[PDB]
Design a protein around this motif. Structure first.
Motif, PDB file in Angstrom:
ATOM      1  N   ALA A   1     -34.354 -42.050  18.092  1.00 56.70           N
ATOM      2  CA  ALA A   1     -33.522 -41.847  16.903  1.00 56.70           C
ATOM      3  C   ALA A   1     -32.378 -42.840  16.939  1.00 56.70           C
ATOM      4  O   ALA A   1     -32.008 -43.373  15.917  1.00 56.70           O
ATOM      5  CB  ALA A   1     -32.998 -40.433  16.871  1.00 56.70           C
ATOM      6  N   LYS A   2     -31.811 -43.093  18.105  1.00 54.63           N
ATOM      7  CA  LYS A   2     -30.712 -44.069  18.181  1.00 54.63           C
ATOM      8  C   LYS A   2     -31.245 -45.450  17.843  1.00 54.63           C
ATOM      9  O   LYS A   2     -30.588 -46.227  17.107  1.00 54.63           O
ATOM     10  CB  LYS A   2     -30.077 -44.038  19.541  1.00 54.63           C
ATOM     11  N   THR A   3     -32.425 -45.794  18.312  1.00 56.89           N
ATOM     12  CA  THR A   3     -33.004 -47.089  18.088  1.00 56.89           C
ATOM     13  C   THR A   3     -33.202 -47.304  16.559  1.00 56.89           C
ATOM     14  O   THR A   3     -32.873 -48.356  16.014  1.00 56.89           O
ATOM     15  CB  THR A   3     -34.337 -47.258  18.862  1.00 56.89           C
ATOM     16  N   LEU A   4     -33.700 -46.304  15.847  1.00 51.77           N
ATOM     17  CA  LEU A   4     -33.973 -46.429  14.416  1.00 51.77           C
ATOM     18  C   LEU A   4     -32.802 -46.090  13.489  1.00 51.77           C
ATOM     19  O   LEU A   4     -32.890 -46.366  12.262  1.00 51.77           O
ATOM     20  CB  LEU A   4     -35.186 -45.610  14.002  1.00 51.77           C
ATOM     21  N   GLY A   5     -31.791 -45.432  14.014  1.00 56.17           N
ATOM     22  CA  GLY A   5     -30.606 -45.052  13.281  1.00 56.17           C
ATOM     23  C   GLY A   5     -30.583 -43.706  12.647  1.00 56.17           C
ATOM     24  O   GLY A   5     -29.767 -43.446  11.735  1.00 56.17           O
ATOM     25  N   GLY A   6     -31.463 -42.806  13.105  1.00 53.42           N
ATOM     26  CA  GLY A   6     -31.427 -41.493  12.563  1.00 53.42           C
ATOM     27  C   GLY A   6     -32.710 -40.732  12.830  1.00 53.42           C
ATOM     28  O   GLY A   6     -33.573 -41.192  13.540  1.00 53.42           O
ATOM     29  N   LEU A   7     -32.787 -39.571  12.180  1.00 51.02           N
ATOM     30  CA  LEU A   7     -33.995 -38.700  12.216  1.00 51.02           C
ATOM     31  C   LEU A   7     -33.879 -37.757  11.060  1.00 51.02           C
ATOM     32  O   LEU A   7     -32.848 -37.072  10.912  1.00 51.02           O
ATOM     33  CB  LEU A   7     -34.095 -37.950  13.511  1.00 51.02           C
ATOM     34  N   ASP A   8     -34.940 -37.658  10.261  1.00 49.54           N
ATOM     35  CA  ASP A   8     -34.908 -36.734   9.131  1.00 49.54           C
ATOM     36  C   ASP A   8     -36.015 -35.687   9.122  1.00 49.54           C
ATOM     37  O   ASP A   8     -35.859 -34.647   8.506  1.00 49.54           O
ATOM     38  CB  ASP A   8     -35.062 -37.555   7.870  1.00 49.54           C
ATOM     39  N   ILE A   9     -37.100 -36.005   9.787  1.00 44.48           N
ATOM     40  CA  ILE A   9     -38.344 -35.160   9.769  1.00 44.48           C
ATOM     41  C   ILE A   9     -38.903 -35.149  11.189  1.00 44.48           C
ATOM     42  O   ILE A   9     -39.033 -36.212  11.818  1.00 44.48           O
ATOM     43  CB  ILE A   9     -39.408 -35.804   8.850  1.00 44.48           C
ATOM     44  N   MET A  10     -39.283 -33.954  11.669  1.00 44.26           N
ATOM     45  CA  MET A  10     -39.886 -33.769  12.977  1.00 44.26           C
ATOM     46  C   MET A  10     -41.210 -33.050  12.747  1.00 44.26           C
ATOM     47  O   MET A  10     -41.180 -31.931  12.199  1.00 44.26           O
ATOM     48  CB  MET A  10     -38.982 -32.923  13.877  1.00 44.26           C
ATOM     49  N   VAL A  11     -42.310 -33.677  13.159  1.00 45.57           N
ATOM     50  CA  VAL A  11     -43.626 -33.062  13.021  1.00 45.57           C
ATOM     51  C   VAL A  11     -44.140 -32.734  14.428  1.00 45.57           C
ATOM     52  O   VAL A  11     -44.507 -33.630  15.200  1.00 45.57           O
ATOM     53  CB  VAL A  11     -44.611 -33.951  12.283  1.00 45.57           C
ATOM     54  N   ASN A  12     -44.155 -31.442  14.772  1.00 40.78           N
ATOM     55  CA  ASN A  12     -44.624 -30.959  16.039  1.00 40.78           C
ATOM     56  C   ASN A  12     -46.125 -30.715  15.911  1.00 40.78           C
ATOM     57  O   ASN A  12     -46.568 -29.556  15.725  1.00 40.78           O
ATOM     58  CB  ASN A  12     -43.868 -29.675  16.372  1.00 40.78           C
ATOM     59  N   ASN A  13     -46.890 -31.776  15.989  1.00 43.57           N
ATOM     60  CA  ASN A  13     -48.333 -31.773  15.784  1.00 43.57           C
ATOM     61  C   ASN A  13     -49.171 -31.568  17.023  1.00 43.57           C
ATOM     62  O   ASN A  13     -50.210 -30.898  16.953  1.00 43.57           O
ATOM     63  CB  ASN A  13     -48.735 -33.070  15.054  1.00 43.57           C
ATOM     64  N   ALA A  14     -48.753 -32.144  18.148  1.00 45.78           N
ATOM     65  CA  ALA A  14     -49.573 -32.082  19.363  1.00 45.78           C
ATOM     66  C   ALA A  14     -49.789 -30.670  19.842  1.00 45.78           C
ATOM     67  O   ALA A  14     -48.896 -29.813  19.781  1.00 45.78           O
ATOM     68  CB  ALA A  14     -48.905 -32.899  20.458  1.00 45.78           C
ATOM     69  N   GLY A  15     -51.002 -30.455  20.315  1.00 47.97           N
ATOM     70  CA  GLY A  15     -51.407 -29.161  20.890  1.00 47.97           C
ATOM     71  C   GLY A  15     -52.748 -29.318  21.565  1.00 47.97           C
ATOM     72  O   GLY A  15     -53.385 -30.375  21.499  1.00 47.97           O
ATOM     73  N   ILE A  16     -53.216 -28.284  22.270  1.00 51.33           N
ATOM     74  CA  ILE A  16     -54.535 -28.313  22.886  1.00 51.33           C
ATOM     75  C   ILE A  16     -55.305 -27.066  22.533  1.00 51.33           C
ATOM     76  O   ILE A  16     -54.704 -26.098  22.012  1.00 51.33           O
ATOM     77  CB  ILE A  16     -54.424 -28.401  24.450  1.00 51.33           C
ATOM     78  N   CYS A  17     -56.619 -27.103  22.718  1.00 49.73           N
ATOM     79  CA  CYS A  17     -57.445 -25.959  22.396  1.00 49.73           C
ATOM     80  C   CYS A  17     -58.143 -25.598  23.706  1.00 49.73           C
ATOM     81  O   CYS A  17     -58.293 -26.422  24.600  1.00 49.73           O
ATOM     82  CB  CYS A  17     -58.443 -26.253  21.307  1.00 49.73           C
ATOM     83  N   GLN A  18     -58.385 -24.327  23.872  1.00 49.29           N
ATOM     84  CA  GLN A  18     -59.238 -23.770  24.922  1.00 49.29           C
ATOM     85  C   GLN A  18     -60.255 -22.855  24.303  1.00 49.29           C
ATOM     86  O   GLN A  18     -60.044 -22.279  23.242  1.00 49.29           O
ATOM     87  CB  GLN A  18     -58.438 -22.980  25.920  1.00 49.29           C
ATOM     88  N   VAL A  19     -61.394 -22.684  24.988  1.00 45.93           N
ATOM     89  CA  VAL A  19     -62.442 -21.806  24.600  1.00 45.93           C
ATOM     90  C   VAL A  19     -62.825 -20.933  25.782  1.00 45.93           C
ATOM     91  O   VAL A  19     -63.223 -21.460  26.831  1.00 45.93           O
ATOM     92  CB  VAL A  19     -63.683 -22.564  24.148  1.00 45.93           C
ATOM     93  N   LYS A  20     -62.606 -19.624  25.638  1.00 46.40           N
ATOM     94  CA  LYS A  20     -62.845 -18.699  26.776  1.00 46.40           C
ATOM     95  C   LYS A  20     -62.809 -17.258  26.247  1.00 46.40           C
ATOM     96  O   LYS A  20     -61.866 -16.913  25.537  1.00 46.40           O
ATOM     97  CB  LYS A  20     -61.746 -18.865  27.815  1.00 46.40           C
ATOM     98  N   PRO A  21     -63.774 -16.416  26.589  1.00 48.82           N
ATOM     99  CA  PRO A  21     -63.722 -15.001  26.203  1.00 48.82           C
ATOM    100  C   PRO A  21     -62.471 -14.313  26.769  1.00 48.82           C
ATOM    101  O   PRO A  21     -62.003 -14.669  27.858  1.00 48.82           O
ATOM    102  CB  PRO A  21     -64.939 -14.405  26.870  1.00 48.82           C
ATOM    103  N   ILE A  22     -61.963 -13.347  26.033  1.00 47.16           N
ATOM    104  CA  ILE A  22     -60.786 -12.572  26.383  1.00 47.16           C
ATOM    105  C   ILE A  22     -60.863 -12.099  27.834  1.00 47.16           C
ATOM    106  O   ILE A  22     -59.899 -12.172  28.593  1.00 47.16           O
ATOM    107  CB  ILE A  22     -60.558 -11.356  25.420  1.00 47.16           C
ATOM    108  N   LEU A  23     -62.040 -11.625  28.240  1.00 44.84           N
ATOM    109  CA  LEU A  23     -62.135 -11.058  29.595  1.00 44.84           C
ATOM    110  C   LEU A  23     -62.033 -12.056  30.717  1.00 44.84           C
ATOM    111  O   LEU A  23     -61.731 -11.675  31.882  1.00 44.84           O
ATOM    112  CB  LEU A  23     -63.451 -10.283  29.720  1.00 44.84           C
TER     113      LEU A  23
END
Lengths: 259, 259, 259, 259
Positions: A77-99
């Motif tokens: 943000a300092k390099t570009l001179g600001g920040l107006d929008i934050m998109v928290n996009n990253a995430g991961i998925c897992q696949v596993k039965p509850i048990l």
């Protein structure tokens, strides 16, 4: 040119949905802070942003590390001179039965998908409150944040938690002029779904390929989602035309979950 | 006498809502497995169960320890000769603005409120599947599992996650004849709310006492909730009259959240 | 730009939110079919559209007349050379306690708000299907279509009904390439709320001022909504960035109802 | 036992779900006011109630007639010496695509399903208030009051409307000591679904068998609902264990709709 003079940060920006978001925001006028985990793929996306005529900063970061996220986002943000929008996009998925879900497994998905969103909201809100910016926080949720799905219990739990965080943060940050919303995609057509199907098959005994096909058959509009479909709605949420929207977790899913 | 010949396990059973649940299930006919963290207070509740004419087993356990929960619940079930109902009641609350939540804090509340529910579902479902029991899993949720509240972001996030887990587990466990539902209380009148109000005051600058009063003023029915109010609905969920209900997270809240 | 080449129809277009919607869709490129009940004020609005270099058809219609709405819409679509977007905006409000609602009163609001939406959906989808166009139906819903409000029983019932018809229609029309969504504004006008607040005190013994505070000063963003706020989101729903969104009833309400 | 000394009224009581409800409330202790449209079958059901040692009043009524419902209910309540519980069970179903719904058709179902519920609420709350009793209003909703179903647009709209009126009424009547809740069954009869399945294929090009599989074989518990399943939950809502529950529309649906 909705986003002229604006600066947007996107996590998971090197590929997939985050890359599509980064490029769309850049096309609409924003300079972009690209955050992900591999420098070489980040650098490529950064060049595509710069080719569209914008400024880009591309930094590796671990969204699950609170203090490092804060400092890295602040550096950019300092390099570009600001920040107006934050998109928290990253995430991961897992696949596993509850048990069969194990302690390290569930700690890992919460650390990335829940803490990582939280840390990004905190990092961005801190910067916004510094200049009085009317900032926008936009979180990645899912159809699985509105309904719990079989074999996706851990993932669904984290996306419900992101919805909660969206709501509580919208209420608390409104007096600082900051809105907080989430986007909820459906079945986004990727090699990722081929992997999900494979796992799901080995767990259940269905045929490889059958589960992904059956899921696609469920979508009312009759086609899978593209990363650009998601980006188009993120573009709306980044714009002035979303100023009065806060606390919402909106489904762009082809007609899978109806709220 | 809905629960004659049944065995129910309740976490957080030594006091408060869990104690009320334990006693109500015992009155309706069940023998009770009481799980909590202090042996001396557990022993007292156990004696009240035995005074109502039932069998009780009272064991300390850490609901966040997956393997120990499994073994302890199994020991208690062996002692009584079965298990038919699992009430995952224990949980903790935190009060902290979104911007100020720290990593150890949020790890702690997820470990107890989310992992602890999961581990109890797993421990009970394992036992049910051993004898073909048509078992019931009943989770503690909250108004905060349906809406995110200010200063309660971490707590709300965990109760949304419990709702997710409820849904995914209902779908996955239905073929084993096991139902999974949650109960969602409102403002349960306790010294606990006096503590919440105190914290909320120091955070915001409102007067001590004012916030708890304002919350009570919001309840449509005009009175606070008793632990017996919650127990009455848990008694319904434990009964035959709930056989066809699964996946639901039902508000008994005096008219605070409307779904 | 965004709606270049498109043709949109908007009910209640002469004034208010519907006029804002019409003017925004025109600014974005669409020729407009303006439907309302008073020719003189329709003519004024048509002249504003024409000043943009857009084409306008302005016709009086009763949305509650199924066959007339069908033929009038078809007449206008023929004049302009097609129809891409149908906005069912027009509706009425009533303020009355549940106990005092009368037969002619409730029939009137259902005629306008529910039948009128259904007849518009039918009129537009008939045109889209007979021509093969991938059309968009956009219905006016409300915060009151997501939660029932005191003294707004009848209105809330109609808006809930509108959300139902949005979801059923989305499911049935998807295979014809037609999407159906609703927009759900919050509080625009404040006078109705003073009325509601007074009447709530009289009928339930609430304090004067207390209902207005709860709902009007309960908006997270801390300000009432404008017609432009509403029109901005309708413009998104008209655009190709909403192509993948169907069956949804999205809140643009300043943070009042959280889903 | 549970309803000792109470008096309940049930619409649609002669047959079906309403007869099951009436018989269960009688078994639980309540004298019953049986309201339906055919005297001969009402008389049969009254005789079953009387065989339990309960008192019954059986009267023909049209729920869509506001004033007549008011006076007939009052006449019966006078005969029995009070009224504690009102169950607005009676309603109708229609199967018709959104595009084909006609004016007299939609007016009919709203008259019965929405006006009829409202008139019952009014008739019972007038009695509760004039006497000062803490009464309970219990309305029949549906899975289709939570999600719009294909070919069930009109029915879904009415059930969504019922949920709205439940919430507005709960908010307005709480200060008189009256609770208002709804029960939401899933799939009881299967023939309608075969019809819907066929007609969906004809109107959207779905495969024959595929809609029935989605909805009927989509029930998590793997079996259709019985009238006794429904009556069991209505018995809970009639009981003092529901005293603190208001404004809610609870799904007892075998795991079809998840909220």
């Amino acid at each position: 040119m909705s986003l002229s003079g604006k600066i947007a940060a996107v996590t998971g920006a090197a590929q997939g949905i985050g890359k599509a978001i980064a490029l769309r925001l850049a096309k609409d006028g924003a300079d972009v802070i690209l955050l992900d985990v591999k420098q070489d793929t980040l650098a490529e996306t950064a060049k595509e942003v710069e080719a569209l005529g914008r400024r880009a900063v591309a930094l590796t970061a671990d969204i699950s590390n609170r203090d490092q996220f804060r400092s890295t986002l602040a550096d950019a943000a300092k390099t570009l001179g600001g920040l107006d929008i934050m998109v928290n996009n990253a995430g991961i998925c897992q696949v596993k039965p509850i048990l069969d879900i194990e302690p390290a497994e569930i700690e890992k998905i919460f650390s990335i998908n829940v803490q990582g969103v939280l840390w990004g909201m905190q990092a961005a809100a801190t910067l916004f409150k510094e200049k009085g910016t009317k900032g926008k926080i936009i979180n990645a949720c899912s159809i699985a944040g509105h309904e719990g799905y079989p074999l996706l219990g851990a993932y669904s739990a984290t996306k419900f938690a992101v919805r909660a965080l969206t709501q509580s943060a919208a209420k608390e940050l409104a007096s600082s002029g900051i809105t907080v919303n989430s986007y909820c995609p459906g079945i986004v057509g990727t090699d990722m779904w081929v992997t999900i199907d494979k796992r799901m098959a080995e767990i259940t005994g269905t045929e490889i390929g059958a589960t992904y096909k059956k899921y696609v058959e469920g979508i009312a509009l009759g086609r899978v989602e593209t990363a650009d479909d998601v980006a188009g709605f993120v573009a709306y949420l980044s714009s002035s035309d979303a100023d009065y929207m806060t606390g919402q977790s909106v489904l762009i899913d082809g007609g899978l979950v109806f709220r």
